[PDB]
Amino acid sequence: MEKFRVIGSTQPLQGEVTISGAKNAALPILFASILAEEPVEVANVPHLRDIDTTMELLERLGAKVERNGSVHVDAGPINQYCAPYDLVKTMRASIWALGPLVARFGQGQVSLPGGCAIGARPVDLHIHGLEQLGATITLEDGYVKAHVDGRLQGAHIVMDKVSVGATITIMCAATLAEGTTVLDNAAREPEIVDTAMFLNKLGAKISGAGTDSITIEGVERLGGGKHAVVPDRIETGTFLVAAAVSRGKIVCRNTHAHLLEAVLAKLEEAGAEIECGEDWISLDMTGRELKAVTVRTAPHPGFPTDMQAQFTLLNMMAKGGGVITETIFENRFMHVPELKRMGAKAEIEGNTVICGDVDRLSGAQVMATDLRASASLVIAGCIAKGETIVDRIYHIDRGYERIEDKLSALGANIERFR
Amino acid sequence: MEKFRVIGSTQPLQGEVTISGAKNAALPILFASILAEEPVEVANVPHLRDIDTTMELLERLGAKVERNGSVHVDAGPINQYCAPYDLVKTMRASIWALGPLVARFGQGQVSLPGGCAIGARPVDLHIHGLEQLGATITLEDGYVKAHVDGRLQGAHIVMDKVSVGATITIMCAATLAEGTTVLDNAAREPEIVDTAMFLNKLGAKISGAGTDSITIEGVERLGGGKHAVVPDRIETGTFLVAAAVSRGKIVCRNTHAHLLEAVLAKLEEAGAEIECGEDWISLDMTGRELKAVTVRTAPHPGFPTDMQAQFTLLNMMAKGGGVITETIFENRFMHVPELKRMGAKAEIEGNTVICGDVDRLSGAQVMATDLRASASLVIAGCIAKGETIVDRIYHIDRGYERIEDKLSALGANIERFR
Amino acid sequence: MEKFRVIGSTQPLQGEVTISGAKNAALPILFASILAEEPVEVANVPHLRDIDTTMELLERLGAKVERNGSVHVDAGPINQYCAPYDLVKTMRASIWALGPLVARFGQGQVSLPGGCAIGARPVDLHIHGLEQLGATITLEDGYVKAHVDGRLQGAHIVMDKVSVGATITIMCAATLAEGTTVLDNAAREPEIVDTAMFLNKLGAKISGAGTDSITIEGVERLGGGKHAVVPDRIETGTFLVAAAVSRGKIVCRNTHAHLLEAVLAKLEEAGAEIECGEDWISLDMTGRELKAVTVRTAPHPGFPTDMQAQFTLLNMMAKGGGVITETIFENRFMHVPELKRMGAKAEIEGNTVICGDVDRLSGAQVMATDLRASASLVIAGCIAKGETIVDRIYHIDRGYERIEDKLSALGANIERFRD
Amino acid sequence: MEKFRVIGSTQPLQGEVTISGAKNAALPILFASILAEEPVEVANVPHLRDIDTTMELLERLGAKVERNGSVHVDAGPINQYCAPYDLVKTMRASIWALGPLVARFGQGQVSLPGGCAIGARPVDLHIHGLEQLGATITLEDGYVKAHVDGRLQGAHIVMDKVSVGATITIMCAATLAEGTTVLDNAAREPEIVDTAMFLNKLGAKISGAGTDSITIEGVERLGGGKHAVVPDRIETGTFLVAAAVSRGKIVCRNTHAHLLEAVLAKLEEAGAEIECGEDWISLDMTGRELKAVTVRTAPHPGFPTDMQAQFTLLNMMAKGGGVITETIFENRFMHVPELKRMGAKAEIEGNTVICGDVDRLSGAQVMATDLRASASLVIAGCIAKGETIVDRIYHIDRGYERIEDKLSALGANIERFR
Ligand SMILES: CC(=O)N[C@H]1[C@@H](OP(=O)(O)OP(=O)(O)OC[C@H]2O[C@@H](n3ccc(=O)[nH]c3=O)[C@H](O)[C@@H]2O)O[C@H](CO)[C@@H](O)[C@@H]1O
Ligand SMILES: CC(=O)N[C@H]1[C@@H](OP(=O)(O)OP(=O)(O)OC[C@H]2O[C@@H](n3ccc(=O)[nH]c3=O)[C@H](O)[C@@H]2O)O[C@H](CO)[C@@H](O)[C@@H]1O
Ligand SMILES: CC(=O)N[C@H]1[C@@H](OP(=O)(O)OP(=O)(O)OC[C@H]2O[C@@H](n3ccc(=O)[nH]c3=O)[C@H](O)[C@@H]2O)O[C@H](CO)[C@@H](O)[C@@H]1O
Ligand SMILES: CC(=O)N[C@H]1[C@@H](OP(=O)(O)OP(=O)(O)OC[C@H]2O[C@@H](n3ccc(=O)[nH]c3=O)[C@H](O)[C@@H]2O)O[C@H](CO)[C@@H](O)[C@@H]1O
Numbered sequence A, B, D: 001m002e003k004f005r006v007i008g009s010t011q012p013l014q015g016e017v018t019i020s021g022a023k024n025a026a027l028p029i030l031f032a033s034i035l036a037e038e039p040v041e042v043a044n045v046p047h048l049r050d051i052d053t054t055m056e057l058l059e060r061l062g063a064k065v066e067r068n069g070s071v072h073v074d075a076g077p078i079n080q081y082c083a084p085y086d087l088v089k090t091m092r093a094s095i096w097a098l099g100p101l102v103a104r105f106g107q108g109q110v111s112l113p114g115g116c117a118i119g120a121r122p123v124d125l126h127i128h129g130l131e132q133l134g135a136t137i138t139l140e141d142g143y144v145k146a147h148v149d150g151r152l153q154g155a156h157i158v159m160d161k162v163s164v165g166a167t168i169t170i171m172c173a174a175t176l177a178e179g180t181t182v183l184d185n186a187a188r189e190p191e192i193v194d195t196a197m198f199l200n201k202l203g204a205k206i207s208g209a210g211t212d213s214i215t216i217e218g219v220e221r222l223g224g225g226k227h228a229v230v231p232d233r234i235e236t237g238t239f240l241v242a243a244a245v246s247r248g249k250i251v252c253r254n255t256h257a258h259l260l261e262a263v264l265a266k267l268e269e270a271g272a273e274i275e276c277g278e279d280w281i282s283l284d285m286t287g288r289e290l291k292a293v294t295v296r297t298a299p300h301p302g303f304p305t306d307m308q309a310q311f312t313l314l315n316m317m318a319k320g321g322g323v324i325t326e327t328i329f330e331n332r333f334m335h336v337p338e339l340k341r342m343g344a345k346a347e348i349e350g351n352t353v354i355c356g357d358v359d360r361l362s363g364a365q366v367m368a369t370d371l372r373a374s375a376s377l378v379i380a381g382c383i384a385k386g387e388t389i390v391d392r393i394y395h396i397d398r399g400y401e402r403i404e405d406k407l408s409a410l411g412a413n414i415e416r417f418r
Numbered sequence C: 001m002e003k004f005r006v007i008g009s010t011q012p013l014q015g016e017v018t019i020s021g022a023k024n025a026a027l028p029i030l031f032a033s034i035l036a037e038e039p040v041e042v043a044n045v046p047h048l049r050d051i052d053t054t055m056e057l058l059e060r061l062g063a064k065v066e067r068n069g070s071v072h073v074d075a076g077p078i079n080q081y082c083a084p085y086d087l088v089k090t091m092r093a094s095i096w097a098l099g100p101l102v103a104r105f106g107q108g109q110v111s112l113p114g115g116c117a118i119g120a121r122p123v124d125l126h127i128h129g130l131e132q133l134g135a136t137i138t139l140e141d142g143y144v145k146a147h148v149d150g151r152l153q154g155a156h157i158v159m160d161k162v163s164v165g166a167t168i169t170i171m172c173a174a175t176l177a178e179g180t181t182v183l184d185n186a187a188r189e190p191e192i193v194d195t196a197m198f199l200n201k202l203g204a205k206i207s208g209a210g211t212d213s214i215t216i217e218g219v220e221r222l223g224g225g226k227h228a229v230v231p232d233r234i235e236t237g238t239f240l241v242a243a244a245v246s247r248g249k250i251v252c253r254n255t256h257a258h259l260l261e262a263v264l265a266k267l268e269e270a271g272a273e274i275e276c277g278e279d280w281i282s283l284d285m286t287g288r289e290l291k292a293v294t295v296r297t298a299p300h301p302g303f304p305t306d307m308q309a310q311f312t313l314l315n316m317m318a319k320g321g322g323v324i325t326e327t328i329f330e331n332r333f334m335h336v337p338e339l340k341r342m343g344a345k346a347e348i349e350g351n352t353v354i355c356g357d358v359d360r361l362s363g364a365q366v367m368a369t370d371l372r373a374s375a376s377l378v379i380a381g382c383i384a385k386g387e388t389i390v391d392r393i394y395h396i397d398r399g400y401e402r403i404e405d406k407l408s409a410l411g412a413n414i415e416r417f418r419d
């Protein structure tokens, strides 16, 4: 198991960082490419483990896949329709293959994702969504087995809850259904907007993406095309926090303020000065005193739960307390007892963390548990005093491309080892 | 203390009900008219106590007010700026007086509302939204005291949580600020749309209302005009549920399905046949079995917390159990133990009620506690066996207009008495 | 509708206060006397609205009832078996009438309590506990109708949750059942112990009260007798909070520390010097810095939920934050938005209050919603700057005896008034 | 990693099983023996990973240790005082080393445990209680470092909350203090009672163990002795559920009903025939109808949280719903989504699972995440239709001795493989 050895410092993290394509846009785009009958190019895809898994999954369906900067996909010759346990237990996102498969081939099988470290994370909304589009779905031997005689049919659908994943499953499958689909109470996340933009280039007709009502007019087939994935707003916030919490000064390139206004306002409120350009965001925390903030996770454009662990660390270092309420997932405070091992002060109650204030963390051996928690611990390591060992660092590589290099270019002292 | 004596019946409720203007659009529109220098007419306003309290409150500022079908307001000669405790303790919506006063006159005092039966209901967002428009705000003798030297200044504001009230405060006040305001993560409720249509008729420049990003270009003054208040989606919901739970058959006039797509979909799922027209909605339940649903309250267009009490009842009488989860207010199951007095089966756990199934309620003396719970008890009274006395019915009059007359036309047996 | 006009001061509250008998012991014991075939005298009973309500409820069953220092009760000639809606809507402890009546007479009807301000407060455990003693129970037109053909039958009962009320129902009712009952996971509140002491004087055979396992050996009947009610630990805590929060000095007479060790340790943790005698407790906070504390309400001997609102105020005036977590009742933070009107700082999330720090509160008009919140507002009145009007003050009289007079003896400026 | 291959059947699980000594007794007793200057012998100790790890902990302090039926410990020559990271990350109960060490040697160091999967599990109450006995405690490099100049000082302590672990820590440490200690609001779990019996045989002076006030009079030193560990009530509960959920008939030996009255009563309420002897409990579910039940977890003698996963399975197979509220640990529902893979039906909200009804589960591949979930998954494997693979089965050996053997003796078809 790979680990990070991090040697901390009161040195501010400063410099520049090039922000990669969004993990959470590139995934649903690549799964959406199953619908396409012609070759497809997806530019600005980061190198992550979840993309290798996704790439392998498409290969195992009969698609031809190749990558470096872009990923090229020829989904034309797809002639298998299963996403097996072996891969799904690796990556629950695999659920996204069920919609495109049934919609294009009338058939689809996908291992039901078991339990996630951050929550039970059921998929009822995906299932009920495709059923509403005319599919028949069962569970046999732990596989969600879906099928429809003919084409899926357009329907008016109102989501019980706001769900990113399910909004996508339904929107994507609806592109090849007969007639028109109106999905109400959809999620507004910008990766949804990007997945629609991509599909529309292939010959789909999706309108209202990024509003709570999405209209999809079904077409008989989708073609080919090129698309550059939207920048990663979470990677972006992650580095801004890294600068904020170290009295630092950083500019993020190839990223856009409109993707993360809630985070940018919270960072301004915690003391930072923020500037924005055509395609960059800068943060200056030099000579500014870090102040605690109150936070409530919520659907976009509210505060994203993917920034929650990073702001737990911020508040732990910020004077004036700091309270974080997590509404989205039920078990996403696993970073707290780890940070406590480094001398951090906080208390948990239901869905809320109440942070104390601490001048400086102490290096210690800690263990990553999930993707965003993992990053917070590495940042903690950078500012702490002495040597930090972050075990199980493969979690980071699921969502950050070569984070040790990116942070090293900012003055961090990080070693990847076995 | 007025009461309702209801004699229940197995007879399904049938007929027509004419839906009134939305209470929650009428109110902010009325408070918004404080910004107007010229006479205003607000049509399609229901007769509720809360609208009387709002009228009394404008009178006390120096406005000229009168009504019957419409409400007529001349806020030109206003020369006092305090909303006093004796009225605010009656109706917390009075905080809406603060923003217009300070925006137009540079000054405002409103009594800080105390505890609500359904929740703590703080107004921290209203105060902090106004502070970002450049107002200086104190609390003194229980009065939220706001002031600004000159005009408020437009700003970029990102809401910390979704709030209907706070969104309104900020939008209305920004219509007279110098420069442009952008309000992100605003509430999307349809009463916000209405208020904004109203304000634009007076010379305001508000775009994006009904989306999560509201842009307001400030103007130096607003003039006069005439506006008709959007129909009440909650009152619509309430009668649709009455029909459904008595296995009956109704049509609601002067309403629009697009105001309540979440409610209509749960009524369909529960078994009801629903048709919609240009300005009407019907529900037919005759010879259809009532089926339990799970519901989760959320901000519009999700399932409204103002429909939750009524849907508790529906589940209590429906087969298959039913689960209602309330995310918005922390204490809105006060109806449950009073319904249990009538023989209902339910268990509360945290923010969730788990309903059993019951064939028919039994009449009993019960007590209304809040507006929406009140109507649930009344509906319950109509289907129960024997006589139900609902104490403290003045709550119903705050939000429904002569509901004993509307239900009477549908065949209910209801007496108002002391 | 009565109010208090409180005028605040920085002068610490100082002096003595004589603790009355526990309301929450007085009540079960009076409902318990329904079992008694002959005269009973209950000493050390406070003068409260809830006791007046209990005495009328007893009268309406056919008991003969008088009071002043004590309450005298002859339950011998009881001839009716209904607790009517008009009384239960007033006081939900009226549910305790169900078990004695069914146990002694084979029958009892009691109106099913509605919603309470502080939580839904179902009574399913009382009912189920009585069903398991052999009773048949139905809900008919809002009334809990219980009957049994003959005497109740002892049973081994394991409580699904800890409930003060239900433990008492089952305990009392069991004293006239045939054979032996063992109640497990029983509440251990001292008011249960005192009710058990009371019943045993009348010829009952209750053992293990105050532990999690209570054995009741049923008897055929119960005599009469005399009992002085245990001190009120909540009133005790409430005055000790008053001294502490006013940076003052107090001694409470006719009370015992062993009733509230959890409150005392938190008061010491808040920075107070506390001393105890055989029947008194003193607190001195003079020259001392009030420090915030974290609290988790929990069954006795844990931190009592009835002290929560008062400790909410304590933490709001204390430095260092302060976190209060309520695990018992679901909606018991109504005092918070009212204290906010007086300038307090706190935020609520779920079952937890996170308190800020404030040097001095500010007088304002405020509304009592419940008994314990009522007292916290009064105490806040005493230390705030200026005048405070506490509306709907009748709540306080449900559980405190002439509280304005007790506070006035300490230095407070309080006026009960109308209109 | 070892796995179980289970092949399910409708065959009822029937026969006998011998209950071992309680895991949760044997551990605190073996940590308690750090106090003793003379050899100690602890009989009826189960063969479990956690007991190997404890024996290793003890040796590393310099104690002499053998086992098989019993564990022998000679703590006399202890010359070291650290519980290192490499052991604590394996088993957080190593915290119980801290108290005995500082009590006996004036010094102790223990790695601050990180996150547990079932909750954050802080240890604040152990620290604050040892400080109240006169210890000075610090956090340094992730180690809890305790020390006192001389002997500990008996104190009057009220626990902020009920904690099994801290109760024991404070109780054990107090046996060597100068003077008397009174631990109010103490935990009452029978494993505390057992530990105190063990200590009094060595010369300690503990009384009240079993109630909420424990009085310990300090002595100078403690000698040696023999003690048979109390039967495991959770292992007992677990086999009783296995029979109940299989329409089965079982008798458990070397166990006592008074250890688990809460569980027996819910089993009876579920429709099972229970009978109890001097040292046995039997359950007969043959030809009986399994009925759902409600459970609220709570401190002993309430319903134990270590039975909650098993009772989740039970209610999932029982008719009439089933609600389970967990009030002790904040993330103890990880079995749920894994059972869903097997066709189980249930939803979760906050601290509560709302169970549906299923006639028979479907074999699938599933993942154990903790001790009690692990066992519930194996039992589900025995009653499901088809083949079930439970991965990461080492979890189960942390607390159940040779469970595949105990279950085969009841009819089951289980295979341990790699
Ligand atoms: C795009 C991606 O690869 N993963 C992201 C995606 O996860 P994901 O799409 O799983 O997140 P969702 O918005 O679907 O889920 C949010 C909440 O809704 C619940 N829910 C969801 C579906 C369902 O059928 N039933 C149900 O109850 C989930 O358990 C969770 O409690 O959005 C999350 C919300 O920002 C991000 O944190 C994840 O990083
Ligand atoms: C229009 C009107 O007269 N009343 C409606 C309005 O109330 P209202 O405008 O009060 O509702 P909000 O959306 O503002 O409140 C929603 C949640 O946000 C919280 N919050 C609100 C303001 C604030 O400054 N801080 C804060 O934390 C509230 O306590 C609540 O828990 O919207 C509610 C939600 O649809 C409706 O049920 C009410 O019937
Ligand atoms: C007259 C009297 O002595 N009143 C006290 C008594 O009230 P009371 O006896 O009502 O309080 P309980 O101990 O019964 O209630 C504890 C918890 O159990 C729940 N519950 C209770 C009974 C039941 O049948 N089902 C059920 O679910 C309640 O809703 C509550 O959440 O104890 C409370 C808790 O210490 C004190 O605050 C009250 O001042
Ligand atoms: C080795 C052992 O005997 N383990 C058992 C023991 O664990 P353990 O002794 O760790 O359990 P505790 O009773 O201490 O913990 C109960 C609750 O208190 C909290 N807490 C605990 C200690 C502390 O210092 N601060 C704090 O907040 C925990 O988060 C938990 O939510 O009791 C549990 C409760 O039945 C059982 O499930 C475990 O199997």
Ligand SMILES: *[C@H](C)[C@H](O)P(=O)(O)O
Pocket: A088, A089, A090, A091, A092, A093, A113, A114, A115, A116, A117, A118, A370
């Ligand atoms: C953990 C985050 C989930 O189970 P995965 O499928 O995304 O790994």
Ligand SMILES: *[C@H](C)[C@H](O)P(=O)(O)O
Pocket: B088, B089, B090, B091, B092, B093, B113, B115, B116, B117, B118, B370
């Ligand atoms: C209850 C709904 C609130 O407290 P009000 O101010 O509207 O009376």
Ligand SMILES: *[C@H](C)[C@H](O)P(=O)(O)O
Pocket: C088, C089, C090, C091, C092, C093, C114, C115, C116, C117, C118, C370
């Ligand atoms: C409120 C405290 C309850 O409903 P009561 O019966 O004591 O008035």
Ligand SMILES: *[C@H](C)[C@H](O)P(=O)(O)O
Pocket: D088, D089, D090, D091, D092, D093, D114, D115, D116, D117, D118, D370
């Ligand atoms: C999980 C059960 C805890 O971390 P452990 O230390 O007992 O493994």
Ligand code: NA
Pocket: A292, A315, A316, A317, A318, A319, A320, A321, A322, A355, A356, A357, A358
């Ligand atoms: Na902080």
Ligand code: NA
Pocket: B292, B315, B316, B317, B318, B319, B320, B321, B322, B355, B356, B357, B358
């Ligand atoms: Na139902």
Ligand code: NA
Pocket: C292, C315, C316, C317, C318, C319, C320, C321, C322, C355, C356, C357, C358
């Ligand atoms: Na404080």
Ligand code: NA
Pocket: B330, B331, B350, C330, C331
């Ligand atoms: Na609540």
Ligand code: NA
Pocket: D292, D315, D316, D317, D318, D319, D320, D321, D322, D355, D356, D357, D358
């Ligand atoms: Na079930």
